[PDB]
């Protein structure tokens, strides 16, 4: 074996120029795609508000134009998937994961158009789902497309270009280049076997994607939270405590998304029509609550500044947590196209500040700021449920830029994954590819 590795040690990182260059174009397309998707979600969201002003006296009629406007776009997105591409429901990260384990196709000729348009319907109606879900699966399939159209052969090329696509997807959805690379390296690579994924190439496309976004998105941060205070050593144990509660809740939240997947299938039975009207009902509740109580609906990125700044009561904070747990399940367990990441960031922060609020009142000697605990709980449900702590950590850091808090973010994150494991939880993307693979055999 020894002489074989002196051979291979000397051949390390020599990615084929063909794959390097193609990973450039994959990154550029996923960029424009994600940018396109983002502006479409935004534009539908504004026109629905401009409807609520055409109708701003008759509060009953207003509440109805709320419901119907989201119900329609919801259905349209629901319908697009079950008629033309059912593997584009939900997040789609798990599908792209199976594509890398070579047990699931990448039907780009169908998914790109349905996920894009079907997502815009459901996201642009204001249901609580993230841009991530669409972009990442849109980006993988743009990888597969670029592969087939140039007919590049070999296993490096297929798994690389599909990784670099799903990477550049997440990066473009969050403006987080490092988080994109770390997300495939930590979570999306095939996890039980060696692989041929060039990470120089993943890096090449992530760059391209991030510049694409920057061209059409300069000026404005997804999440502006300002520079918070520091964490004294003698306050660190408080974050390990915050971790443990994330690490018991983490698995319970997974239980709920899985059981509510079951529970909602019992409603429509699988019937393409009762399903699409069930999604019209969910969409419309979200567009109604969008008007009636915005902190319960939508992706969640807006309340993140407010909650970190301490500008919510704890009364309101408990309201939003229960409420957003509920809309989050109903939206993501129903199968609508749309990610689970960005609502898990919001869910996380609000619980985080609520801890900090209690913690501030209990130890004035610590000179706490209730908002640092918010930053440390943002990627904490990502750690406890997705079991991608290193990705949540760098994702939260890329978005909120308070590096002075890296230690407490780590400490809450590790405690989340640690108690997640020791409590008996399973990685949630893994536990649903599992189930779609478990039926993709139990029908034989």
């Amino acid at each position: 074996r020894r002489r074989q590795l002196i051979r291979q040690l000397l051949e390390r990182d020599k990615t084929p120029l063909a794959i390097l260059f193609m990973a450039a174009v994959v990154g550029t397309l996923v960029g424009l795609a994600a940018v396109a998707f983002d502006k479409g979600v935004a534009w539908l969201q504004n026109q629905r508000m401009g409807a609520l002003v055409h109708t701003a006296d008759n509060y009953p009629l207003l509440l109805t134009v709320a419901f119907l406007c989201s119900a329609v776009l919801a259905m349209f997105g629901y319908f697009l998937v079950r008629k033309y591409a059912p593997e584009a429901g939900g997040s789609g990260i798990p599908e792209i994961e199976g594509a890398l384990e070579d047990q699931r196709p990448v039907r780009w000729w169908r998914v790109l158009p349905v996920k894009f348009f079907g997502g815009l319907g459901t996201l642009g109606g204001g249901m609580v789902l993230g841009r991530d879900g669409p972009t990442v699966q849109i980006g993988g399939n743009i990888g597969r497309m670029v592969l087939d159209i140039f007919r590049l052969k070999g296993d490096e090329a297929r798994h690389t270009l599909l990784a670099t696509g799903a990477a550049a997807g997440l990066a473009a959805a969050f403006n987080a280049p490092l988080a994109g690379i770390l997300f495939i390296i930590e979570e999306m690579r095939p996890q039980f076997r060696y692989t041929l994924i060039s990470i120089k190439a993943v890096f090449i496309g992530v760059i391209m994607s991030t510049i694409m976004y920057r061209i059409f998105n300069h000026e404005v941060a997804l999440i502006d939270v300002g520079k918070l205070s520091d964490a004294p050593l003698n306050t660190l144990w408080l974050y390990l405590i915050l971790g443990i509660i994330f690490g018991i809740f983490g698995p319970i939240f997974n239980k709920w998304v899985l059981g509510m997947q079951d529970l909602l299938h019992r409603v429509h039975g699988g019937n393409i029509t009762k399903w699409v009207l069930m999604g019209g009902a969910i969409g419309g509740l979200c567009g109604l609550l969008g008007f009636v109580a915005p902190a319960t609906s939508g992706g969640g990125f807006n309340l993140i500044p407010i909650a970190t700044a301490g500008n919510f009561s704890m009364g309101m904070l408990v309201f939003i947590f229960v409420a957003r747990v509920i809309t989050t399940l109903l939206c993501f367990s129903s199968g609508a196209p749309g990610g689970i990441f960005a609502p898990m960031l919001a869910l996380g922060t609000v619980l985080g500040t609520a801890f900090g609020m209690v913690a501030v009142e209990l130890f004035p000697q610590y000179h706490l700021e209730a908002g640092t605990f918010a930053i440390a709980g943002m990627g904490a449900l990502l750690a406890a449920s997705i079991r991608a702590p290193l990705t949540g950590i760098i994702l939260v850091l890329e978005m909120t830029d308070n590096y002075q808090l890296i230690l407490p973010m780590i400490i809450t994150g590790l405690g989340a994954t640690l108690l997640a494991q020791f409590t008996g939880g399973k990685p949630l993307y893994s536990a649903i590819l599992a189930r779609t693979l478990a039926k993709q055999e139990a029908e034989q």
Partner: antibody
């Protein structure tokens, strides 16, 4: 260097009120908790209160309602203390301080020269 | 709240000689600080977290303690060590100083 300059102390008649001032130079007066400690005629140091850089937190020592009122104007880089209903117990050299920590056990980092308040008829 | 009581409320000692102050707390306290004060001038931070000197404070000075008894000592005293040394706590809220001990030259 770092400079803390208190003004505003003088003679006050009992039951009156005053407003002492503390002017900060040589450092970013934001990012720091500020504090007030007074030392009575020949006795020990006693903590009045403190204010966080954003004025979202203001904690006082055990003592009545409008007692003292700490406030800060990071725009002009000065810290304030209003005392009301001044009794003779309030005759004291009043110190302004900047707070910090090491392991997280907070301490009184840099102090000013002080001002004296005499309350007397 | 915590009550710090410093031991030799007042005391003299000759230069080049080893002195030792005490700080004794009603309940338990962690990482105590010590301020030197000489008349007419603001208190100075001297020793913080039970043990660490401030940048400038010469190395003769030192402190140590745990739980409920703490101390400051001056291996070789100078003449300029004449001042009042206030121990102070913030392990608990609210924070409390001690009474002080004044240290004067002996001649």
């Amino acid at each position: 260097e770092v400079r803390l300059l208190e003004s505003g102390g003088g003679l006050v008649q009992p039951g009156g009120s005053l407003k002492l001032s503390c002017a900060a130079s040589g450092f970013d007066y934001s990012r720091y908790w500020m504090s007030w400690v007074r030392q009575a005629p020949g006795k020990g140091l006693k903590w009045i209160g403190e204010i966080n850089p954003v004025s979202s937190t203001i904690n006082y020592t055990p003592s009545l309602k409008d007692k003292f009122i700490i406030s800060r104007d990071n725009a002009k880089d000065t810290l304030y203390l209003q005392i009301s209903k001044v009794r003779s117990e309030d005759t004291a050299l009043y110190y302004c301080a900047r707070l910090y920590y090491g392991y997280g056990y907070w301490y009184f980092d840099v102090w000013g020269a002080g001002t004296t308040v005499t309350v007397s008829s | 709240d915590i009550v710090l009581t410093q031991s030799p409320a007042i005391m003299s000692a000759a230069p080049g000689d080893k002195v030792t102050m005490t700080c004794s707390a009603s309940s338990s306290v962690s990482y105590i600080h010590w301020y030197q004060q000489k008349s007419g001038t603001s208190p100075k931070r001297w020793i913080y977290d039970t043990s660490k000197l401030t940048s400038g404070v010469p190395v003769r000075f030192s402190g140590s303690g745990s739980g409920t008894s703490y101390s400051l000592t001056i291996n070789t005293m100078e003449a300029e060590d004449a001042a009042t040394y206030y121990c102070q706590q913030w392990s608990s809220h609210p924070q409390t100083f001690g009474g002080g001990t004044k240290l004067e030259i002996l001649r």
